[PDB]
Assembly symmetry: D2
């Protein structure tokens, strides 16, 4: 009933330290006052790491140039999923780190992560040698490893998308959903889950497998989710766990970004699920 | 930046005290070891209140007779939603109190509640004079009122059900879902949300409005959810907040229970949403 | 088993808010890295209140002038008692607020307080209408009132001083101590308590009564404790609770400060105990 | 900024597990309701370990025989130092384990420990191969090792006793105290510390060194502290750390107990300090 503690490691080190320190602060603070507050906590923790030169934030129009300067670029969403504060659904924080220099392909990521503020604050992190899952130990004030080299199932049994947009679906989404509900091979239909908070839905996709979609649709031809600080980081994590992440027409990490608040479609998860979605597009 | 504390009140009092004490213990402990553990914490907290005579638990075949005896009956589900432990989705605890004497109509409830183990542990409670929402303050070890007399919206804009069971839907569910996605009156389609944990989905239904369904279907003609300790308590809370709860053919609280682990269909939420569902059945 | 919360009140308001916010941060962080850290947390919380113009800190040679400027002066000791970090003895934080303008008599204090970092973080605060005791509720992140208008006993039964300095005592300390151990009126001797951390010893003096001494001695003719940010604040709190605080030759709050790091002797507590000490000096 | 956890080990194992589980509960609960409550938590945690046959508690007249029976005896004080609840001084819990069978010499201890409820809950534990110090991590609900094989200084510079009992001192205490205040070898006098809570004073003695005394005196010829569940356990811990513990006339661990609530004098700490005290007795 007793434990020993040991330091763990995956300038980059100091940067992640400070990004984790901001996440701890965000955790405890979990209204748009909250967005404003989360934003400043990340920007000032990150600047003071002396590890950054450029930040892109979901809450700022323009890139933020550090005075304190280091070699890394960070694109982040400091608080995502806030339309769910009341229902205690888990909101999250998303970040990707690079060496504008924030308009690089996701291919170039050196580190990325998300935090999920649930009954425990969980962080998925990767530095390019797999995904590790941590939980925040608020007593210690430190992140404790819970799962090393997390791998996603080859094929799952859950599909995750807002089916209330059915009337707006493109033809490949319509087909794919039809296949999940009415399998043509004698298998049982997939179950459906959709929390409405991207980090909560992605995290479930990692740990139980299956597929998550926020595809193009009639109302939103480029999707809703943001390339630099939502889609690229989760595509990186999911790919490091053995999954796939596509826009429908190319890998998310291969998209050349055209603007820092650019949106793209996002389909990710277990690889054989994503590949079946892609087969619906090719038609 | 400073506060004062005052005691709040809605034998019954001692019983709720002990039910709240079990919820605190359950909270902190959030594998079927966990189910076993939650079960014993509730049974022994409840027996020692000296306020009970009969308990029905989701985890026990037979009713449990208290040796210590008082005037109240309690039907409870000590831990619901466990298929979601990993994805940090909020699991819950559900209870209803009555004065077998556990086979009474929901109409006879004297008190009911749920707890939702999210980033905060929230409890919805009613003693028949509305719904109050509390949060667990683990420092104090006590529940703090956050919202008095919670009211549900007359009509919402979210529908909540596993649409992966489409191939098994009865005709009224098929129609209703079709209406939410393809409104015939020029309105925008409803959004869809489904966490897959009944307390998390019901709680969202209370606080944002709309509708939650686990109706009859081809695989499960009596639904999945359990009348005594899942459906009746949430129907009571939702009705105390101004909503409705139906099996499709009658109010949940009016169903005469035939066995303590009986299942029924469950459709609840904003009243005009439920009434529109009922209009799909009458056809 | 349930509670309601209500806001409590004693520019000044914003200042105390920020001083309380620094105390929360200090609490959690409880090595001289820690001193450095506590210092910056107070200085930057206090500056940003936009309520200050001058700060005196135990850790800074010179007064710190705020750029952000308001009407209040604050003398503080951000972390006192650190020679006791290991033995879990409670360390503290001490502050006094005024309207150099930090060289005012204690008579001029508008507010003062201490925090004691024990199993709970306790704050004694006064704004000149008595003393209120609060505990930090780290869940809420807020201070909860536990005792209103705290009054110290007229006479206690504990005396508190480092008796290992006996060989250095001045004659009045020698006499007083002799009286506590060998009462000449048939009463039992006082008990002795000395934690070696000024805030822990003062706090015990408030809540149980008796007397606390760090008098002049041969090694230290002006005592050890610092007038601006140790002695004046605790003299203010203790006097607001009905006690007395003397240097041996005058009330602490009447001493005209000659330098911001000036030391003075300190004898405080229950009034009849202090008056008996003063009777030993007059001889 | 990240950590990994590993299980640590020093029927005996299950017993310590349950003793640690009681300490966690006691911690959080920190009035004699509290004594009653702490007592029951230990007795019922300990019985259910299925590792015990006999318990001696400070709060029970008679030994408690377990129905559930195992090979170990436990003498404990579930809550000590309660006259200090207000002043946040650390109260503690003390226990010793043996294989009446509770009237054994301290020499026979198989394990012993104390917990100190300060800003962190600390446990000193030994199973006969030195002392290890742990802190309670309430988030994890588990004890984390902070210091392995703790050793006490050969000689310290603090002496700890209620000097308000001077008029009642026996001649050897009078002499020893005189030596600490007026060293005859040109050295500086020792400093004095006395919190008035035995576990807080013993713990300081371990971690900073020096000496702690609750000797015989005129009012109390057998001292105050209790042999089975106060004096023997701390003598065991202190001796495992390289110190000494004497009654003045023999080692505490060598005293043959005559009754389960027997008192003895207690002088412990750094060995050269204890030996100097013993030199004052031999005269």
């Amino acid at each position: 009933d007793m434990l020993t503690l040991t330091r763990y490691v995956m300038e980059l080190t100091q940067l992640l330290n400070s990004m984790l320190t901001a996440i701890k602060a965000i955790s405890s603070a979990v209204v748009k006052k909250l967005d404003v507050l989360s934003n400043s906590l990340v920007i000032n923790m990150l600047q003071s790491s002396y590890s950054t030169c450029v930040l892109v934030s979901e809450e700022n129009k323009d890139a933020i140039i550090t005075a304190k300067r280091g070699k890394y670029v960070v694109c982040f969403d400091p608080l995502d999923g806030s339309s769910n504060i009341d229902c205690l659904a888990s909101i999250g924080t998303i970040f990707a780190i690079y060496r504008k220099d924030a308009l690089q392909c996701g291919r170039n990521i050196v580190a990325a992560g998300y935090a999920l503020y649930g009954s425990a604050t969980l962080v998925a992190l990767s530095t390019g040698q797999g995904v590790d899952l941590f939980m925040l130990d608020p007593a210690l004030g430190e992140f404790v490893l819970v799962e090393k080299d997390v791998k996603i199932k080859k094929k799952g049994k859950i599909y995750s998308l807002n089916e209330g947009y059915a009337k707006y679906f493109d033809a490949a989404t319509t087909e794919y959903v039809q296949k999940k509900k009415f399998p043509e091979d004698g298998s049982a239909p997939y179950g459906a889950r959709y929390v409405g908070s991207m980090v909560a839905d992605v995290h479930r996709t990692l740990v139980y497998g299956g597929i998550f979609l926020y595809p193009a649709n009639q109302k939103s031809p480029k999707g809703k989710l943001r390339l630099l600080y939502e889609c690229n980081p989760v595509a990186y994590i999911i790919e490091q766990a053995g999954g796939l992440a596509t826009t429908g027409t190319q890998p998310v990490l291969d998209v050349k970004p055209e603007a820092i608040h650019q949106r793209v479609p996002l389909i990710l998860g277990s690889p054989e699920d994503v590949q079946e979605y892609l087969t619906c597009v090719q038609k």
